[PDB]
């Protein structure tokens, strides 16, 4: 399908639990790449921080990591997703089920 | 709300390479100069993030606080205290029944 649905969460073990990190429900194009998604996450996190500072009593804006994207495959293990892959290809190659695609993130380091 | 602002970069204290694009703003007369300075900081930061988002670069990053001025007679600009309400600024300094003209520059 030209459109793709994602359920996007912090990696369960590569990132510390954070009750402030909500599951994200995302629709984008199948032709979007993993690189677009990783860059999106960094931008979204920064936008949210800015808006949160805006509404807080802080007068100074302080305010940046790069992220790797993972998928849990049928084996239950995780695969690091190549940045050049389209989300369409990821769905066909690694997810293969008729459900919104569950993807995870953790910092590149 | 009821206070109307025509908000511009300080003509001289600018960074030449930056946009001079006038902003048109409405808010409550009870808003303070500190609210307006902070609003600017947030808006510029948001605009910069979205711009980087749309740029070809894969790497982002994290800037400044701002001083607010109003023009006065003659050929000068008066720095406005952050605690002043915008209503007070219009009555004290602007006076005329037109959208108020304010200016900004990074706080040195």
């Amino acid at each position: 399908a030209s459109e793709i649905e994602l359920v996007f969460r912090p990696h369960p073990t590569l990132m510390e639990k954070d009750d402030s990190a909500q599951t994200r429900y995302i629709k984008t194009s199948g032709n979007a790449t993993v690189d677009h998604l990783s860059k999106y996450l960094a931008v979204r996190l920064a936008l949210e921080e800015l808006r949160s500072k805006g509404e807080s009593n802080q007068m100074n804006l302080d305010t940046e990591k790069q992220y790797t994207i993972y998928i849990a495959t049928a084996s239950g293990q995780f695969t690091v997703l190549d940045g050049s892959f389209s989300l369409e290809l990821v769905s066909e190659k690694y997810w293969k089920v008729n459900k919104p695609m569950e993807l995870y993130y953790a910092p590149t380091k | 709300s009821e206070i109307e602002l025509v908000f511009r970069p300080h003509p001289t204290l600018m960074e030449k390479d930056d946009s001079a694009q006038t902003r048109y703003i409405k808010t409550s007369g009870n808003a303070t100069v500190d609210h307006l300075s902070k609003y600017l900081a947030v808006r510029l930061a948001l605009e910069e993030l979205r711009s980087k988002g749309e740029s070809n670069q894969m790497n982002l990053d994290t800037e400044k606080q701002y001083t607010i001025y109003i023009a006065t007679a003659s050929g000068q600009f008066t720095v406005l205290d952050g605690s002043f309400s915008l209503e007070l600024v219009s009555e004290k300094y602007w006076k005329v029944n037109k959208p108020m003209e304010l200016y900004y520059a990074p706080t040195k």
């Binding site: 649905e5 359920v7 909500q22 629709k27 984008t28 194009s29 677009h36 931008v43 979204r44 | 749309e54």
Partner: peptide, 30 residues
Amino acid sequence: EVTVTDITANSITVTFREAQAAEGFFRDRS
């Protein structure tokens, strides 16, 4: 709400639409 963000990579811009819940957003697969 549904935020909409445009992101560029490798000279292609795409849109990401994001909601805070699946219900009412994701399509019915039944």
